[PDB]
Amino acid sequence: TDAPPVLFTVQDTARVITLNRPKKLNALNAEMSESMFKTLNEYAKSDTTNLVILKSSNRPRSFCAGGDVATVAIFNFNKEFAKSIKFFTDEYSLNFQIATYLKPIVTFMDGITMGGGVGLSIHTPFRIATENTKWAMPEMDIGFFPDVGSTFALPRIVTLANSNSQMALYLCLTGEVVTGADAYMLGLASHYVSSENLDALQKRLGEISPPFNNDPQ
Amino acid sequence: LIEAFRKEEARLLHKHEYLQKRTKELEKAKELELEKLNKEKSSDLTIMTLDKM
Secondary structure, eight states: OOOOSEEEEEETTEEEEEEOOGGGTTOBOHHHHHHHHHHHHHHHHOSSOOEEEEEESSTTSEEEOOBOHHHHHHHHHTTOHHHHHHHHHHHHHHHHHHHHOSSOEEEEEOSEEETHHHHHHTTSSEEEEOTTOEEEOTTTTTTOOOOTTHHHHHHHHOOSSOTTSHHHHHHHHHOOOEETHHHHHHTSOSEEOOGGGHHHHHHHHHHOOOOTTOOOO | OHHHHHHHHHHHHHHHHHHHHHHHHHHHHHHHHHHHHHSOOGGGGGSOOOOOO
């Protein structure tokens, strides 16, 4: 009866995953993570799905404002540590699945991509940014650590002043927000596409298919 | 003739009991089969749905 937290749809041979928690800026809870993790395993087995597209239904307001840590805090105050460990096992397992996924995943970072949102894009070779992109890792102000494999990605993908992870440490320790073109130039975003062009891009992604006897992997 | 009348009555009564037992079995099997059909599988995640609407 209630609107599902994550909506799954078919786009020709592309499968679109849309985060559907607009009031929470698409915050990721255990339910969302579990649903996406299970549905991605099915798409990996399927021979009719060529690529996946992870987007939000709230763009350009936000793509993912971060994992739902406020709920994890209440668990700690209530000693519901089993619930908290379930939230992180689901989220981190989904970030590991995306990183090692054999089919192309294309994340549309059209909006605030902070925290868990970074985990949804940092692990994909096709992480598209827009003028509305706002990448940040504001965990140092909440007392947490740089999670979602950001300590394995940022030290390996940043482009400038990252010979010894200097820039990676600057973003993770200061929580600086990077916006649009700057995210693309730093290596946080693989591509820079105008938000107006995302609809057209989505359609083209659904229409392309591996040629002859080549699999999508 | 006495054996014929008593065997026929026994057969008729035994046939009613067998039908009742058989029907109940079939009914139980149908419920089980239907329950398996309604069981959610992992493949169901790949079937698009609009439950709310």
